[model samples]
Target: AMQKFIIHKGIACPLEYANIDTDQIIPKQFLLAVSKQGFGKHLFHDLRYLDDKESVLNMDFNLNKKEYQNSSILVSFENFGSGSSREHAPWALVDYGIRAIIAPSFADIFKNNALGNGLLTIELAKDEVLEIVDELKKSQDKNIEISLLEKRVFFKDKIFSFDLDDFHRICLLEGLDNI
Candidate 1:
């Protein structure tokens, strides 16, 4: 699916963990569907659910919390998308309503898959990422604004700049997708 993205403003969920790989992200067992829909419920199924059936929610997981339930942006630590290449990872995230992901670094393959689907992946300095996490933790309002046009992230007066590939940026802006 192609989605036009110019500027995005939404709630940001902070996941402090590092090295969150594609396996842990969507898990292989849940990849049965050829369509991207319905995978959102299984996103992070292993960590988010108490059992293999995914009937019970892990209250300890930040994403299961009330405040982060509606988050459209995810703020995570370094190597946010690591492990074997899997398009399902980004598909699950996008299906879960996460339009953008902010991290220190991402797997090259993951970046390509994410950007191709209009799922923006922003890379920032490690310290800057940490600051965003800290701010989101202490503040009651979890909202953050991002401008893909300017390649900047805004959070309550503190602005962080990020870089993206021009080709991907253009594709996102124009809502291009591979057939």
Candidate 2:
């Protein structure tokens, strides 16, 4: 029994750089856990690992930067969550507090996993996504709004609509079992 779906609002982590694969999202070594609870601590473990310590506060990583910290929505370039069919990838993202993702495209399995967990994956045009990333980079405040119900993103007073199958959208909005 899945919980009822609820829309989430948060600042966006604009990862405009492309080719971000699932392995990069959650390295294979961290997949040893059977449960997802503690996986959050290991999300992006490879990227955040420093001297064998997983540190989220490392200033070098974009995700660890002060402006992008606390962001629950991730905006990235094309094929954002590509490579591998590991469910742990989405688990890691959810565990790390990402409720949704906005990308020009996503790997098939990665998209399905994201939807299964009620993590909204929005598909946008490459140029449009880049525009949003540019705005966020230049802004003093890096907050971007996403509404699953509206299927829209609000950035820099501009609205970008996302394309999703009607059935998938309904399933996400209701958090219903996939039929």
Candidate 3:
């Protein structure tokens, strides 16, 4: 399901938490058998739902807001994917329509897992991360333009540049998978 990524436009989901581990991304319990597409439903089970019925989306979580429900990008805190090396974590993210994640840092294994699947995990300075989060919070319609062709993010009229390994960059641009 890899797709060439040149430019992507969408709203962002802001996860204020740091150290968002694999369990939080896709609870290990969900890794059990009997599944064709049930993982998507349990993407953020613990953090998204308040009870077994999941009748009420956790209003406290930023992803629950109507404006961010369809967001394909996630603005998050540092060490975004800090936990065991679980491939299911990135799978849940991709299945959730989150193609990109902006954070100060990400766990090595998790980052690679995401890139292998065409998920753009961009690491930026702490300051730049804050600016995007602020702007996203101020307005729901504000879109963050991710340009792989330019290696920049067009935000609030400012160009925020990011660095990526040449191999991963080219792979994403060409829609190539190592697997």
Candidate 4:
């Protein structure tokens, strides 16, 4: 059976950079196949490791940090998912256990891909988004709540409402494909 997504509450990994493109998400070399099996191993292949041969994970990186390991929510700055319109980017993220992304903005194509694959892509004001990132950075153990049913994010003891078109929200809740 397909996995049914529900509200998730967990510590988030915030990658505070902009213009992170699809190639950077999965890299071009790993796009050689139609299969998705090993793409998770290559998600952020370039940034996650040095030259793909180094077993030593970049501990300083947000995703690699012990406190953030296994985190399912990813937060980022503007244009969080930019560049190529490859659906593989979101696929890779999901494969790596990221079920949602929060950012000030997302590339149009990337957002669509995320939505289609059951990955929640949320947009918030720049300042508000930064505040969330700051909180996560300070307390890697802090738990953030993402309610797909409520269409809201709970953080720092406050609820941040997210805006999504009604149709999209319904589609997400029902897991319906756009025809």
- Each model's RMSD to truth, in Å? 1.4, 2.1, 1.6, 2.0
lDDT of 2 by residue, 47-112 (tens): 666657664355566787888878788888888788877888888788788888888899888898
Our tally of clashes for model 4 stands at 0
| Pairs that clash in candidate 2 | none
lDDT of 2: 0.77
Residues 59-83, model 4: lDDT tens digits = 6677887888788888998997888
lDDT (tens digit, per residue) of candidate 1 on 1-179:
76888999999999888999998899888787576356898898888999878899999899999988698999998888897778889888988899999999998888888898889999999999999999998999999999999999999999999888788898998898862
**Candidate 2 has what TM-score?**
0.89
Candidate 1 stretches with Cα past 4 Å from truth are none
| lDDT assessment of candidate 4 | 0.80
Report model 1's TM-score to 2 decimal places: 0.96
Evaluate residue 178 in candidate 3 and report its C-alpha lDDT on the 0 to 100 scale: 66
- TM-score on alpha carbons, each prediction: 0.96, 0.89, 0.93, 0.91
Q: Which numbered prediction scores highest in lDDT against the true structure? A: 1
Candidate 3 lDDT, 131-173, residue by residue in tens:
8888788874757889998899887687898999888898889
- Arranged by lDDT, best first: 1, 3, 4, 2
Q: Which of 2 and 3 is the better model by TM-score?
A: 3
Error of 4 at 114 (Å): 1.0
Q: What is the lDDT of residue 149 in candidate 4?
A: 81
